[PDB]
Amino acid sequence: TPQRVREAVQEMLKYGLLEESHKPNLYRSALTNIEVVDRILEPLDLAMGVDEVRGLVFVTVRQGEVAEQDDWSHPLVRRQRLNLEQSLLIAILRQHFIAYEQESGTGASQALVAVDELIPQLQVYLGELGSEAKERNRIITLLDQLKGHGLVSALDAHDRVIIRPIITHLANPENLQALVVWLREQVEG
Amino acid sequence: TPQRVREAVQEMLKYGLLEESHKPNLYRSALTNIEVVDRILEPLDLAMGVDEVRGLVFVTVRQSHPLVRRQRLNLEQSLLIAILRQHFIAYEQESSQALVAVDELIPQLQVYLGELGSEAKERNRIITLLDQLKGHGLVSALDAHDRVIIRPIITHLANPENLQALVVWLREQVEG
């Protein structure tokens, strides 16, 4: 097995994804060896997902013949599940990412969002607390929880966060449709 | 790829150790398919090590590794590791599972770290050290009669380089 293929596979398994704008060599190596990487990851019940438009390569749970495997009981998955509050915040961030990606042209940039923009839109649904410090603590805690899934970054000195492109593959239309169906079932009885 | 082979490989990669007494089916599947496991773990720069004497299957870095973090342990953990290793060696020289009472190790810890002057302090120190070693998966759960079980992995605790370092540190501590 070639050294570069092994290095790229190990790096991707370690971090969970490869981005072209940060690790171009490994991204190119892993992009041109789809069959080899798939054969390597088959024994581990894992698969590789590709996105050439955004320059992204990520790792997902391989789909089995069982109708429902729940995709979270896989032994190698270490994170916890996602509850309703985090799903709501993810939906808000996805809307912001749509807005960012629509009005962009050729060139490299990043999606930055300030907390003060996020606070009122979440107040609309969750409600309002007495002081401002309470709401700031709530938002900071939620963003810290979301950082563990690799969806955002830590707060800057100017009180801003970066939205990672991987969210575009977490809230793709299929997953959104499934979530909407499930939530509609939950609400109506 | 057979389902049992994949299950055994995934379990071993999750835990790092396989014992026949705990998961006999996975142990049998892994021990009868050495070449398949080696082929599977080759791209990940990992290899399988077998100890049929105790039924222990472990993973070694075949050749500082992207998937593995190196750690260093303090003297308060190193001397307890030495004590547990020598206790397990004494137990296996007598010929199952090595059972060590909590009160047994208290004098051995006091003769090297001094006496705290309180039974509660000694109990808390022993419990904290045992929990820290439980984090590394070196001992089993505490028994009802204040006893712990030493896992066979202590036999392959490290290479002889670390054993030499451990015995040198133990001798220096005994010197005081």
Binding site: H74, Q86 | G16, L17, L46, V68
Partner: peptide
């Protein structure tokens, strides 16, 4: 307004699955 519903698990698949930290063999 209920903490029970805010922490109820939702349905969203694991994407970008990182490995389980280590193979649990520190050495």
């Amino acid at each position: 307004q209920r903490q029970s519903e805010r922490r109820k698990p939702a349905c969203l698949p694991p994407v970008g699955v990182a490995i389980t930290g280590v193979p649990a063999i520190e050495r």
